[PDB]
Design an enzyme around this catalytic site. Structure first.
Site, PDB file in Angstrom:
ATOM      1  N   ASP A   7       0.849  -1.177   0.000  1.00 12.01           N
ATOM      2  CA  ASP A   7       0.000   0.000   0.000  1.00 12.01           C
ATOM      3  C   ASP A   7       0.893   1.237   0.000  1.00 12.01           C
ATOM      4  O   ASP A   7       1.835   1.316   0.763  1.00 12.01           O
ATOM      5  CB  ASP A   7      -0.866  -0.051   1.223  1.00 12.01           C
ATOM      6  CG  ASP A   7      -1.485   1.291   1.572  1.00 12.01           C
ATOM      7  OD1 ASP A   7      -0.786   2.067   2.297  1.00 12.01           O
ATOM      8  OD2 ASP A   7      -2.687   1.555   1.180  1.00 12.01           O
ATOM      9  N   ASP A 105      -3.376   2.930  -5.448  1.00 14.55           N
ATOM     10  CA  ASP A 105      -2.313   2.907  -4.486  1.00 14.55           C
ATOM     11  C   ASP A 105      -2.272   1.600  -3.703  1.00 14.55           C
ATOM     12  O   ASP A 105      -2.069   1.592  -2.535  1.00 14.55           O
ATOM     13  CB  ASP A 105      -2.421   4.114  -3.548  1.00 14.55           C
ATOM     14  CG  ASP A 105      -3.358   3.854  -2.351  1.00 14.55           C
ATOM     15  OD1 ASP A 105      -4.323   3.080  -2.539  1.00 14.55           O
ATOM     16  OD2 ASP A 105      -3.143   4.383  -1.209  1.00 14.55           O
ATOM     17  N   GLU A 106      -2.464   0.484  -4.362  1.00 17.87           N
ATOM     18  CA  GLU A 106      -2.392  -0.814  -3.702  1.00 17.87           C
ATOM     19  C   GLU A 106      -2.083  -1.915  -4.712  1.00 17.87           C
ATOM     20  O   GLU A 106      -2.578  -1.902  -5.841  1.00 17.87           O
ATOM     21  CB  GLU A 106      -3.731  -1.149  -3.028  1.00 17.87           C
ATOM     22  CG  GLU A 106      -4.120  -0.219  -1.873  1.00 17.87           C
ATOM     23  CD  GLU A 106      -5.338  -0.658  -1.038  1.00 17.87           C
ATOM     24  OE1 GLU A 106      -6.332  -1.149  -1.624  1.00 17.87           O
ATOM     25  OE2 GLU A 106      -5.307  -0.474   0.212  1.00 17.87           O
TER      26      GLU A 106
HETATM   27 MG    MG Z   1      -3.199   5.561   2.104  1.00 13.63          MG
HETATM   28 MG    MG Z   2      -4.443   3.287   0.946  1.00 17.98          MG
END
Ligand code: MG
Ligand code: MG
Ligand code: CA
Ligand code: CA
Ligand code: NA
Ligand code: NA
Length: 342
Positions: A7, A105-106
């Site tokens: 993450d 974002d992961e």
């Molecule tokens: Mg974050």
């Molecule tokens: Mg996040």
DNA sequence: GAAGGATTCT
DNA sequence: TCACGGAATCCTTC
């Protein structure tokens, strides 16, 4: 099966600081100004210096300003954020080709055959983590464990700029001892229903019958929790490719007059199509957030693809379909496409 | 199924 | 024009 999860740390904020390293250390806050009256909108996410004061993604910009009126308030630049994300997504790809890009974002990477025996895994975390730092000036937190779910709890437990492993042992503990609302997928609504039944930790599920839980959370999550609790959970790294593309936008005023709404709905449609690119949807859906928020939607699935031109029209039909069933005024408006042609 | 709603998460 | 953005996905409907 070893699952390594990355993450990225408060992403959109970070990127803004990377592009302007004078901000670093101050509290940057990235927002969606709706021009509906100067500070109308919501936070998007926010630097740690900013978060620690209770300014989090989702609150109103004006709520945030009662808190940090001196903090830096920047407008959300999505494309900028995306091009900096793919650069990173690509970097990790090389590590374990079997990855699954979760969100902007992961990412989950499956490192089962790339490495064995967590000691190794951890070190890779450092490499992955250090490499992004190296290439992108972007700090990330890393979570490792036997499966996606626990790998992510680890990342959750270790963020920001963190790196936690979660060997079975601990895993077997969390099943017993970890709070149920912290299980991924589980939000307040379902947490409150879980407290009511009595269940507070994963292991508790195996104390209640299952058909009951289905009663309150529905088999879907009912199988899910029991699965984790059992330690018998395993979902390999799919690489789910988007299954839905949309846009919703906030009108400068509530409406029930089309000509008024119309220019937004298309503004949405045009974007939604750019976001679609080479993909062709079999289904359209017009979503409208009401002056109340009952989030109403009328749609349609065609037996063929929807050309931009057909997306206009039908939408106007579907907007009209909404305009006279309920009877409330419109806050936001938009479109959502699905059912793509393989 | 297809349709519309509810839920989760930044 | 006076606090609640945007994006998906699931999970349950008739
Ligand atoms: Mg974050
Ligand atoms: Mg996040
Ligand atoms: Ca939670
Ligand atoms: Ca399997
Ligand atoms: Na049916
Ligand atoms: Na029927």
């Amino acid at each position: 099966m070893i699952v390594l999860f990355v993450d990225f740390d408060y992403f959109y904020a970070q990127v803004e600081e990377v592009l302007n390293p004078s901000l670093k250390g101050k509290p940057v806050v990235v927002c969606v100004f709706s021009g509906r009256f100067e500070d109308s909108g919501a936070v998007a996410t926010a630097n740690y210096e900013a978060r620690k004061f209770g300014v989090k993604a989702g609150i109103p910009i004006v709520e945030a300003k009662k808190i940090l009126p001196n903090a830096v308030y920047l407008p959300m630049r999505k494309e900028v954020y995306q091009q900096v994300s793919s650069r990173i997504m690509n970097l990790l790809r090389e590590y374990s080709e079997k990855i699954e890009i979760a969100s902007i974002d992961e990412a989950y990477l499956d490192i089962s055959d790339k490495v064995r025996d967590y000691r190794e895994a951890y070190n890779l975390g450092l490499e992955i983590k250090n490499k992004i730092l190296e290439k992108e000036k972007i700090t990330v937190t890393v979570g490792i464990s036997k499966n996606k779910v626990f790998a992510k709890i680890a990342a959750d437990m270790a963020k920001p700029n963190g790196i936690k492993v979660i060997d079975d042992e601990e895993v077997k503990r969390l099943i017993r001892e970890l709070d149920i609302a912290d299980v991924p997928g589980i939000g307040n609504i379902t947490a409150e229903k879980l407290k009511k039944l009595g269940i507070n930790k994963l292991v508790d599920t195996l104390s209640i019958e299952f058909d009951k839980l289905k009663g309150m959370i529905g088999e879907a999550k009912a199988k899910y929790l029991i699965s984790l609790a059992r330690d018998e959970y395993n979902e390999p790294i799919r690489t789910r490719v988007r299954k839905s593309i949309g846009r919703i936008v906030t009108m400068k005023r509530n409406s029930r007059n089309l000509e008024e709404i119309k220019p937004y709905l298309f503004r949405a449609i045009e974007e939604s199509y750019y976001k679609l690119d080479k993909r062709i949807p079999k289904a359209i859906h017009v979503v409208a957030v009401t002056e109340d928020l009952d989030i109403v939607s009328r749609g349609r699935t065609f037996p063929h693809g929807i050309s931009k031109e057909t997306a206009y029209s039908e939408s106007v039909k579907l907007l009209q379909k909404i305009l006279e069933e309920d009877e409330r005024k419109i806050r936001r408006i938009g479109v959502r496409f699905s059912k793509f042609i393989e």
